[PDB]
Point group: D2
């Protein structure tokens, strides 16, 4: 496959519905060797199974809120892999209040700090911590959402962080690209995943896009996973600092009229 | 003038070179009644003079890092003004390292947190704290920079925060617009101000834009001030959620070739 | 007012509902001296009345499809005015089929050619033809629509031309800006005007934006007019190559969900 | 490969340096069956050789300026292929004057009409003409340039048409997407090809981007070709209405400072 010999660290694989699960299947399929992270001791067993399913014995803890774990993630990885060709950042969080109802109502300095810390800062933080071992055709990929570009009901504080995240893709690409390292994002259309629970009326968004996207259908983690593999691969070697919509075209229309 | 009877609170007036100084002159000129904030007891005397020059006796402390001061700002303002028609947010900060040299080199969780806290979170925080007294044609305005849209040397962490800030304009506009309140940003071209010191090779940017902008000239705080007054006024009553470039057109070209 | 002594040529004033009618009122109000164009001998009497109402005796024919009339417009104008400080381009046309139903169905090379000829090419054509008499702080303004940015039902071929139109603003701004001439566009929200008749289900769009814009209300020609005056004035002297949304913020949201 | 069994019509293969040559190599490599077009009888022999090299005996004339040839292209294609899974539109033209020096200087109604006719209208024209035989996972791809987004020296009139072209991708995607057909564009960075001759100081652009792109290097037709294959393939099944930058990240930065 077009990822033969590529060694790719994936984060955010929490369930088989996860976007990262999709990216993993697509990568493994194309010849990639994978490793995975998890948050807390209580998820260690699940990700070990997941990693086994992709033929991997490489799982490592990493609460991205904690500098020590970030630094130790690559300290550990270093002992198994010589270098890294791919980093998937499929992580986010915002306090429930902050992604529910009115934007101002769920706004506190703490909520803001947390959403940005976890969803935005973590991407270039991992990149910095990975830099020593990154190869010269290495490739970083994060996940964004249209809520960064335009205001979307309930997405609120998360929208702001996603804006910062997408800017981080551009600054990262300039900072790492001299080393041959590419940095990109996929702005995925809505997918029913665990994190999607914290979005009030996700179902409404889901129906709206199935009704209004140009392809008249929602995207699957297989579709996003396929695009991710591409971006992670040398097929996308001319592509960096890009935010790629994989949302059946929804971003490009004014629907509902 | 087209701001007769409008009561406008301005922040970030630090010197006569400040962007907020420009906005104040333009507003006062158009009939507006002004009030101003400052950071710390040691700047109290300077802003009192400044306010005097605009015929105002209304100065209030506000380190936007501190919830208590934010809440007390409008508590104080309430005792003088019944309501507020205009809020200027002309505030930012990033640790010097974080806006110097390579993006990753100046990156720490703390730097990130601070830049975003001060430059991004503060705009909707002030809006939330102002909400009780805001009028029904009230108008909020913040200042952004092109570095939010594309990667610009040295702007680094500040670029990310400005992205979040611009997203905050859009979410703010949806949250406040039912009340008739408009929210906008001006993305100003480079102006030699005090904060511009912390930008390595500001002079290079300044020369580049004077050479490459369509109008072949840099913008002045008078030009930005004039645009701000407009946005703050009922002339811009159909305009909200907008990021307006006032940069002699620089954003719209690919210069240097 | 902030347009004292400015001499501004307006096009596209067809009725009192026209966007150009709004711009004219706002301009005249601010101290501007106006002149107007019309299409065909059979509209000569109506625009002469309109011009009278703005205290002007300056009406000139111009079907922008015809080179001769364009060239003769400024030949005539030259005999009355020494120079021109403002040009309003509030003109568009597309064959009815091309702005109705499915995009491909109403598509013919001729429809395409016509929509682009009239709605796009005419703006820089008039600019070229006006160049000799343009002053050194002169200002050109055209009208666009969100359909240029994203696909909107029925807007079809017109969306493509508007995209070209907005690009023309940018190239115009680089071409004219060394002479100190600014070029901008307003992307107005939907307004019931005569040209809006040719849009199937304009009423649906109108209801949608009143329900979904951040300000929850449609824009008036007074609101657009006010913004146009600003852009035409020296208040906007730092602003060129800009496409300014005056649409109650509609562009910035994903509504309907 | 990931294009096994896909039948793809390519246009614009003029030399081995052509962007379409790159796309063809990548497609053939991935298991695609190809066909090609050419302009005029005097290029028939060259494209027949080219097609041979990709193991194809399918060459067809098509000056996209002519309705008859467009209609006859798919009339002919129908006799060999039952249906079409991929259409590559790698075509453009503008009169030399219109892409040289000052924008206004090279501007005539005719130059405008021609550039738009050939570079913009032809894409949805071919799509309309192909519609009858298009499959249910078919995929259309055109080539754009950054000059559509921002003003670039010398690119002039071509910039306007490219803007219209990119809009066409969006309207096409809504029009064809209910049939399951995806439409996308690649905005490629500068590549020394035959058409690049008509760009004054192409060499200056080329040096600028090699010096200023995040990856510090120019893109090859292999890199664009690889991306095109992806977009044409079912790997990109969740992607439509997208304009994908393959330019080593150049679009995303403000270089030269
Ligand atoms: N679900 C959608 O519709 C959708 C659409 C567009 C983008 N996204 C984005 O896709 C990405 C992946 O989320 P998902 O939808 O696949 O849902 P998910 O619940 O499967 O994945 C979220 C992951 O974030 C991880 N996470 C949260 N806090 C963390 C921390 N402090 N440290 C490390 N990891 C942490 C969780 O462990 C989890 O695995 C997110 O960035 C999300 O914002 C999701
Ligand atoms: N100078 C430029 O070239 C330029 C260009 C585009 C945008 N901007 C933006 O314009 C805005 C105004 O900055 P300026 O250029 O006029 O420079 P400035 O130094 O005059 O103003 C900066 C202000 O930020 C205030 N500030 C910093 N930390 C604060 C805090 N914790 N609480 C309250 N206030 C705080 C300072 O007191 C100061 O008045 C900023 O948001 C800046 O990012 C500046
Ligand atoms: N009403 C809306 O919602 C809306 C929204 C966005 C942009 N616009 C734009 O505003 C302008 C006019 O809109 P309107 O709603 O006021 O419609 P309108 O019909 O009232 O005005 C358009 C004018 O263009 C004129 N015109 C047509 N063909 C011409 C030609 N060959 N030469 C010269 N003039 C010609 C018309 O006669 C009329 O004078 C156009 O730029 C249009 O694209 C309108
Ligand atoms: N080289 C670059 O830097 C660059 C960058 C961005 C986009 N593009 C685009 O890629 C495509 C081709 O670029 P190129 O550099 O390979 O140049 P090219 O000359 O090698 O290829 C262009 C093709 O269009 C053909 N063509 C011209 N007029 C035609 C007509 N009336 N009907 C059918 N075909 C016609 C040409 O003959 C040629 O086959 C175009 O879409 C062009 O706009 C090129
Ligand atoms: C509405 C589409 C969507 C976007 C996300 O970024 C997303 O991921 C989130 C959302 C809120 C909090 N945390 C995460 C990871 C989930 C979603 F369902
Ligand atoms: C380079 C142009 C520019 C942009 C700013 O946001 C700016 O304001 C800054 C920059 C860095 C840190 N803090 C502030 C307020 C100063 C500038 F000079
Ligand atoms: C749907 C909003 C809208 C946009 C226009 O450009 C407009 O002006 C047009 C539209 C179609 C053809 N011609 C003109 C002048 C009218 C409108 F109602
Ligand atoms: C400057 C980059 C560039 C863009 C093109 O669309 C391009 O293709 C063109 C350009 C002008 C006219 N015709 C074509 C096909 C060539 C180029 F070199």
């Amino acid at each position: 496959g077009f990822l033969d010999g590529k060694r790719i660290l994936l984060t955010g694989l929490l369930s088989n519905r996860s976007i990262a699960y999709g990216i993993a299947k697509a990568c493994k399929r194309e010849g990639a060797e994978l490793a995975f992270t998890y948050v807390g001791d209580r998820f260690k067993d699940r990700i070990t199974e997941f990693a086994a399913e992709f033929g991997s014995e490489l799982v490592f803890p990493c609460d991205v809120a904690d500098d020590a774990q970030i630094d130790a993630l690559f300290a550990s990885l270093k002992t198994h892999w010589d270098s890294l060709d791919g980093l998937v950042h499929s992580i986010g969080f915002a306090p429930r209040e902050a992604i529910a109802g009115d934007f101002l109502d769920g706004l506190t300095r703490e909520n803001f700090r947390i959403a940005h810390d976890i969803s935005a800062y973590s991407f270039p933080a991992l990149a910095k911590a990975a830099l020593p071992m990154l190869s010269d055709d290495a490739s970083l990929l994060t996940l964004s959402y249209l809520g960064a570009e335009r205001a979307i009901p309930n997405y609120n504080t998360m929208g702001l962080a996603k804006a910062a995240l997408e800017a981080s893709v551009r600054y990262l690409a300039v900072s790492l690209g001299a080393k041959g390292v590419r940095v990109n994002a996929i702005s995925a259309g809505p997918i029913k995943t665990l994190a999607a629970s914290g979005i009030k009326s996700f179902g409404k968004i889901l129906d709206f896009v199935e009704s209004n996207s140009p392809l008249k259908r929602n995207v699957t983690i297989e579709q996003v996973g396929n695009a991710g593999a591409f971006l992670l691969s040398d097929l996308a070697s001319g592509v960096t600092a890009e935010v790629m919509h994989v949302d059946s075209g929804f971003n490009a229309v004014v629907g509902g009229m």
